[PDB]
Amino acid sequence: AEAWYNLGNAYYKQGDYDEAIEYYQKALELDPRSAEAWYNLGNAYYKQGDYDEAIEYYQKALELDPRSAEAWYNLGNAYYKQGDYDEAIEYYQKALELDPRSAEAWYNLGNAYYKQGDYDEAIEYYQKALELDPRS
Amino acid sequence: AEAWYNLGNAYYKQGDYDEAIEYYQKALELDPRSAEAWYNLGNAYYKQGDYDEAIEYYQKALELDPRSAEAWYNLGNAYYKQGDYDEAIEYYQKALELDPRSAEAWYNLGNAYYKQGDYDEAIEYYQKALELDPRS
Numbered sequence: 001a002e003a004w005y006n007l008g009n010a011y012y013k014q015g016d017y018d019e020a021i022e023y024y025q026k027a028l029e030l031d032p033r034s035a036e037a038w039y040n041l042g043n044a045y046y047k048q049g050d051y052d053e054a055i056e057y058y059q060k061a062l063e064l065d066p067r068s069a070e071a072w073y074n075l076g077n078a079y080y081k082q083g084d085y086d087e088a089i090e091y092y093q094k095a096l097e098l099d100p101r102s103a104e105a106w107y108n109l110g111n112a113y114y115k116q117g118d119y120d121e122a123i124e125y126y127q128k129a130l131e132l133d134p135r136s
Numbered sequence: 137a138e139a140w141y142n143l144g145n146a147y148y149k150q151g152d153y154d155e156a157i158e159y160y161q162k163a164l165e166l167d168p169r170s171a172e173a174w175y176n177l178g179n180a181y182y183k184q185g186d187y188d189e190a191i192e193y194y195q196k197a198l199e200l201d202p203r204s205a206e207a208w209y210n211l212g213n214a215y216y217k218q219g220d221y222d223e224a225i226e227y228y229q230k231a232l233e234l235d236p237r238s239a240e241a242w243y244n245l246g247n248a249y250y251k252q253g254d255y256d257e258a259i260e261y262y263q264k265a266l267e268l269d270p271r272s
Contacts, residue, residue, distance in 0.1 A: 107139055114142070119150040126143040135166050136139035 001027030005037055012040065017048040035064035039071050042078075051078040069098040073105055076112075085112045103133035137163030141173055148176065153184040171200035175207050178214075187214040205234040209241055212248075221248045239269035 004027035012020035024041040031037070042057030058075040062068065076091035092109045099105065110125030130136075140163035148156035160177040167173070178193030194211040198204065212227035228245045235241065246261030266272075 107142075110142070110146070114146055114149075119146045122146040123143065123150070126139065126146060130139055130143065133139070136137065 001029075001031035001034075001037070003027075004030065005034075005040075008040070008044075012044055012047075017044045020044040021048070033064065035061045035068060035071070038064065039068070039074070042071075043074065046074070046078060046081075051082045054078045067098060069095045069102065069105075072098060073102070073108070077108070080108070080112055085116050088112050101132060103129045103136075106132065107136075137165075137167035137170075137173070139163075140166065141170075141176075144176070144180075148180055148183075153180045156180040157184070169200065171197045171204060171207070174200065175204070175210070178207075179210065182210070182214060182217075187218045190214045203234060205231045205238065205241075208234060209238070209244070213244070216244070216248055221252050224248050237268060239265045239272075242268065243272075 004023050008020045008023035008027060011017075011023060021041060021044045024037060024044060028034075028037055028041065038057050038061035042054045042061065045051075045054040045057065055075060055078050058071050058078060061071045062075065065071065072091050073095035076088040076095060079085075079088035079091060089109065089112045092105060092112060096102065096105045096109065106125050106129035110122040110129065113119075113125065114122035140159050144156045144159035144163060147153075147159060157177060157180045160173060160180060164170075164173055164177065174193050174197035178190045178197065181187075181190040181193065191211060191214050194207050194214060197207045198211065201207065208227050209231035212224040212231060215221075215224035215227060225245065225248045228241060228248060232238065232241045232245065242261050242265035246258040246265065249255075249261065250258035
């Protein structure tokens with residue numbers, strides 16, 4: 001599926017999510033056991049704007065690899081981008097338990113709180129993040 | 137700077153202009169090309185009571201974006217709040233050429249004239265504003 005999977009990646013990298021999806025799917029038909037493949041198919045939908053179908057695939061990937069921060073963080077983002085700042089905060093927190101030195105997750109967590117009106121948390125998390133990455 | 141800029145916003149939203157300023161400044165050090173950043177730093181000073189330093193930053197923002205009504209209107213307000221009803225009227229008029237359907241700018245313009253003793257103008261502008269927004 002590595003071939004279909006790779007053809008998927010090329011289209012994805014070119015910016016053609018519709019096609020990336022089709023090929024990731026073909027490759028999952030031939031080999032449905034890669035957390036990576038499921039993750040990227042979810043990413044393709046994410047970029048395409050379908051956060052619903054995206055969560056479905058980030059979820060399948062999480063089963064195969066529950067310790068993958070990327071998928072937990074990307075799952076939060078899917079929610080964040082849909083307004084579920086609460087469910088995204090949860091998933092964002094999960095990603096940090098896994099990778100607590102990711103300035104991005106801390107930053108995004110502050111963002112999720114900020115958007116809900118929780119400024120003291122946003123402040124705390126924004127500070128944690130800037131510590132790790134001093135100058136975005 | 138988006139991170140420092142965002143930390144600035146949080147403090148600003150919490151009501152801590154002294155801190156908002158410090159962080160907006162740090163972010164301008166890292167990226168001095170955002171009209172938005174300059175504008176908010178001016179707003180922080182405005183809220184803090186320093187209309188002088190405020191005009192300086194609303195001015196830098198106006199260079200980067202001469203068509204930003206908000207900054208022209210906020211520049212007038214800075215003046216209005218300092219007694220320069222004449223210079224504020226000018227800047228207020230500029231903001232209306234840009235956004236002539238802002239009930240606020242019309243209202244504030246009537247206010248600036250009213251405070252100078254020009255009641256027929258205040259009357260005209262107050263009426264224009266109420267047309268657009270029938271019931272403050």
